[PDB]
Write an enzyme that holds these catalytic residues in place. Structure first.
Site, PDB file in Angstrom:
ATOM      1  N   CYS A 215       0.876  -1.167   0.000  1.00  0.00           N
ATOM      2  CA  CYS A 215       0.000   0.000   0.000  1.00  0.00           C
ATOM      3  C   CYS A 215       0.919   1.225   0.000  1.00  0.00           C
ATOM      4  O   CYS A 215       1.910   1.220  -0.737  1.00  0.00           O
ATOM      5  CB  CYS A 215      -0.992  -0.083   1.162  1.00  0.00           C
ATOM      6  SG  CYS A 215      -0.299  -0.552   2.834  1.00  0.00           S
ATOM      7  N   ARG A 221      -3.352  -1.458   5.246  1.00  0.00           N
ATOM      8  CA  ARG A 221      -4.125  -2.277   4.291  1.00  0.00           C
ATOM      9  C   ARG A 221      -3.400  -3.588   3.947  1.00  0.00           C
ATOM     10  O   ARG A 221      -4.035  -4.654   3.845  1.00  0.00           O
ATOM     11  CB  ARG A 221      -4.407  -1.482   3.006  1.00  0.00           C
ATOM     12  CG  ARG A 221      -5.255  -0.236   3.238  1.00  0.00           C
ATOM     13  CD  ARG A 221      -5.346   0.635   1.990  1.00  0.00           C
ATOM     14  NE  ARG A 221      -5.728   1.984   2.355  1.00  0.00           N
ATOM     15  CZ  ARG A 221      -5.833   2.986   1.486  1.00  0.00           C
ATOM     16  NH1 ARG A 221      -5.574   2.770   0.205  1.00  0.00           N
ATOM     17  NH2 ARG A 221      -6.183   4.205   1.902  1.00  0.00           N
ATOM     18  N   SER A 222      -2.076  -3.527   3.751  1.00  0.00           N
ATOM     19  CA  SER A 222      -1.298  -4.725   3.410  1.00  0.00           C
ATOM     20  C   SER A 222      -1.397  -5.768   4.517  1.00  0.00           C
ATOM     21  O   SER A 222      -1.470  -6.975   4.242  1.00  0.00           O
ATOM     22  CB  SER A 222       0.169  -4.359   3.190  1.00  0.00           C
ATOM     23  OG  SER A 222       0.388  -3.611   1.991  1.00  0.00           O
TER      24      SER A 222
END
Ligand SMILES: COC[C@H]1N(S(C)(=O)=O)[C@H]2CC[C@]1(O)CC2
Length: 284
Positions: A215, A221-222
């Site tokens: 990200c 998010r990752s």
């Protein structure tokens, strides 16, 4: 406790921030001395996000082997992931060198190039078939082969050529394009559909090198992506799926890269995704 009812118990008691702070307190602290060397300052996007020395990916180069990227190796689930920051103007060639050297099939991108009016990563792949990219510092060529644009994500086929040996490989680019500028998605349905498309491509399977996922910083998010994937795989493998403890899995992953899951809202979203995902797998 089980997951779905632990979930409702945290919602009713409004204690997500306290749960998340406990995780932050218990998380591993390992040295990141190579990341902090002065010669690597322009290889890091954020001064407070660094790979640990023991799990960092090394470039096959004798001058400077450093990239901001970590190998997350999940032993019971039998899955590995490389988590990395969004490439910088001066690291796009290093990024594709890593993809090549680690034998990855797929790249998973969870951000847009511009968000909140600011640049979150470099434009590191070509946008038109007839306009290929050459990375002279690492001697690689990258060509756009095809692009399929859907409502929540785009899939691209790319050709990566090692110009030194003239070998070529097909790389799949999975781009989740609809994560909101602020907060997390209201429903996990499109994120789970995206995860399943990555799985169906072979990009997460043992016959390839680890998937590369990013990200902007490569932790928020990752982290949500690999945490949801690993928890769902463990629920399929074990005799008792209710024994899967998402907080324990997250702490295991934080042995390999700092800061995974950046907010209490991302933690709640990860629970939601695993809960809904476990119903679709079956058997239903
Ligand atoms: C401002 O957010 C309030 C937090 N709680 S809480 C009270 O459970 O910690 C709910 C879930 C996570 C939040 O960050 C959003 C609502």
């Amino acid at each position: 406790m089980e997951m779905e009812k632990e979930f409702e118990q945290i919602d009713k008691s409004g204690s997500w921030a306290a749960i998340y702070q406990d995780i932050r307190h218990e998380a591993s602290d390992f040295p990141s001395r190579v990341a902090k060397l002065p010669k690597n300052k322009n290889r890091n996007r954020y001064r407070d996000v660094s790979p640990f020395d023991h799990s960092r990916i090394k470039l096959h180069q004798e001058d400077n082997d450093y990239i901001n990227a970590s190998l997350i190796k999940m032993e019971e689930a039998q899955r590995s992931y490389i988590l990395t920051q969004g490439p910088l103007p001066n690291t796009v060639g290093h990024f594709w060198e890593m993809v090549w050297e680690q034998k990855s099939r797929g790249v998973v991108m969870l951000n847009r190039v511009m968000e909140k009016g600011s640049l979150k990563c470099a434009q590191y792949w070509p946008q038109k078939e007839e306009k290929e990219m050459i990375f002279e510092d690492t001697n690689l060529k990258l060509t756009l082969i095809s692009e399929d644009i859907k409502s929540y994500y785009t899939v691209r086929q790319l050709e990566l050529e090692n110009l030194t040996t003239q070998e070529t490989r097909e790389i799949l680019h999975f781009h989740y394009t609809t994560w909101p500028d602020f907060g997390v998605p209201e429903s996990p349905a499109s994120f789970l559909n995206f995860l399943f498309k990555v799985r169906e491509s072979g990009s997460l399977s043992p016959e390839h090198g680890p998937v590369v996922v990013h990200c902007s910083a490569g932790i928020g998010r990752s982290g949500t992506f690999c945490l949801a994937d690993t928890c769902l795989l463990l629920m399929d493998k074990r005799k008792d799926p209710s024994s899967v403890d998402i907080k324990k899995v997250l702490l295991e992953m934080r042995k390999f890269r700092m800061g995974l899951i950046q907010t209490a809202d991302q933690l709640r979203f990860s629970y939601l995704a695993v809960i809904e995902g476990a119903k679709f797998i079956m058997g239903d």
